[model samples]
Target: PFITVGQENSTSIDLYYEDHGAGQPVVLIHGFPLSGHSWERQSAALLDAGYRVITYDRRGFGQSSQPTTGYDYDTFAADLNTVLETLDLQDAVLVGFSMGTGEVARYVSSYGTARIAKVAFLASLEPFLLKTDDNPDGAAPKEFFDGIVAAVKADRYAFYTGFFNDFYNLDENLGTRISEEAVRNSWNTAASGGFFAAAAAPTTWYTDFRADIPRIDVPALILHGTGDRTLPIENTARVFHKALPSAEYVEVEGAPHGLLWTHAEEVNTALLAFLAK
Candidate 1:
């Protein structure tokens, strides 16, 4: 049965979550504009590999509450804290993809890794994303994210379709490295979240995590696809690799931003290997 992981304000908007399998726990966090459903493929792989898996929809996405506020990193971290504490998952592996990476990093920095034994960042947005005086190596600027917000505000669905196209690396012939159904399903999952969360959640991506990244002292695995267009490896994973030098980095050649599904075989293999260690 799915449980209420969190309640925001007095509205009783509960974060929906599911748990499967029966060994070491693995909490999977989804990316922007999508819910726990996004991890279905990965969850199945983990479950088949003999690890218990947990996945939840973030607030305002999927079956979770769509609140008007609390879209920032601290609040997101708080919700994650509630889920972990409520579920009583101990020494579990936390895996975050895309924007979900922010949640894992911030959660460790804010709540500490007492319940978490290991972490995996797949196409993570970490250390920092925007260009700042301290993080000159960063690729994105404040204006870049601002333009995205503007585009989202202009036409939410249109922006999402375009965003997903780039995210999946759709070709001129409408072909993708992954299956057409997988791409369409992802688009549908993201579109289910609506306008508010889609617009508000992305603001967190521009947030600087230089302070938080260094605070994560636990062992971490960093995975990124070389062909990712949305969050480039040079900007996201490369910088993250430098920030978390202790982390094991795996580069999936020719994989797009949605490496979790597009390159599940390679990703799952590397992930299982890390978990076995």
Candidate 2:
């Protein structure tokens, strides 16, 4: 079913979502510049496993309404909270990937985990991404993210081309285990998000969730690829594990940042096992 959740604002946005299966609910949040369509592999696997999978396009992505403003984590989390409350999803598993993880962290911090039973972070950017005096182990400098914004505004297509290529680790001597069509499909998904989203969405990457990380009280799963180049495991997932030591952490050796697409089977296997527990 389709609905607009961010109606409290003047630029209310429509969120197009799909709900399927018969068991417990699993809400999958997509990464930056990607729509709900990015979860095709995981959704199919979850449905086959008898899960009630819920996937939606965030504001300004895919079939969802795109607004020129409200691209920060607070709005993103509020949008997510509205979706869950509207759907009345109880005892649900909230899954977020990359920048989408910011929404998950903020939602839990703002609203708590009363409606959620479990949480998973796949190639997450959490516990802080930018280097600060407090977080010396952080991934990149402020200038690095600034450069990305500059790149996006200067030439989104060229930026996305190089972004997708690096996302799948295509430049490695391994020669990109993922097919050209798959890479093109993801690139197109990012490109389809429109110019405003392309320009505004990257800002969420700079948002720090270090305080929010410890507030996630539900059972958590942290999965990251050792070879990830985009949001490195050391910076994001590793830090998350360190903060939430109670979480179940798994490191997929030799896997890249796009493990959701590149290693779908591995991800599904771990996800199903975690849910079963």
Candidate 3:
């Protein structure tokens, strides 16, 4: 359940993970503002389908131990490497969602695809997100990031409640897809995450993953929701698709940033099909 990775000064960061099933391995790297518990529904689906599903909390989130530093993408990836190596997993399918994509990309760049079979990006925040003069089509300006950081620092609980709504697009649909109780459980999960880790997370979002694209030589699946307001398709996944021309890409109809929960059936269908290959 808990595997320790990285030595920050004298601290050993313990990562919380769940290993289930008895077939090919599928490592589900979760999005930001949420933990591995976010993949509860997906894990059950994969488990029932006879695939080994490994879901781990990203450092400071979930039931994991949180250190002051090592919140960067490189360290995040190193933790992933430890998870994979410790389990001695082979033919693994790495499925990353939102901010989780950054770690997947970094892991590929840092370590070759020797142990990997395929890679998937769902609602990824990759290539680059921050708006620049050359890339006018980017997600947002620097001020946009500044406000997010300030909000997290000021009151992370309020941020979790508000962010979860936009994440699942719950406000507009009013529990049509994601229910009220689900949002509250997610709120509780994020509340347990380290405040210092949450404060340091926004900076990792802007770290450009453009160079890591070529390292993804294995089969890759790219999926994104059209209605994602948090990262938006044009700025994130669409750009990512172009960079990885050979990858299988799909656009989920009217799904939000937290489409993993909002559109579980569609998401799981595509993932199970992809994994079936």
Of the candidates shown, which would achieve the greatest lDDT relative to the real structure?
Answer: 3
User: How do the residues 1-277 of candidate 1 rate in per-residue lDDT, one tens digit apiece?
Assistant: 3455445677576788888899999999998777888887788889899999999988888888777778898988888998888888999999999989989999999889889999999998877778878778777779988888889889888887888877877772245447787777877887788578888877888788889987887889999999988788898899888878999999998888877767788988999999999
User: Which TM-score value belongs to model 2?
Assistant: 0.95
TM-score of each: 0.94, 0.95, 0.97
Pairwise lDDT winner, candidates 1 and 3: 3
lDDT of 3: 0.89
Worst 10 residues of 1 by lDDT: 170-179
Put down candidate 3 lDDT per residue, 111-200, tens digits, no spaces: 988999999999998888989997776799888998999999999998988898788888776568878888888888888989998988
Residue 112 of model 2 has an lDDT of 93
Q: Which stretches of candidate 3 lie over 4 Å from their true place?
A: none
| Candidate 2 C-alpha lDDT tens digits along 1-277 | 5778756366667888998897999999998778888999999999999999999998888888777877888988988988998999999999998888888899999999889999999999988888988889788888888889999999998898888867878876234567878777877888778688888877779798888987899999999999999988888888788899999999998888888888889999999999999
In angstroms, the error of model 2 at 121 is 0.5
TM-score of predicted structure 1 = 0.94
Instruction: State each model's CA lDDT, in order.
Output: 0.85, 0.87, 0.89
On TM-score, the candidate that comes out on top is 3
Who is ahead in TM-score, 2 or 3? 3
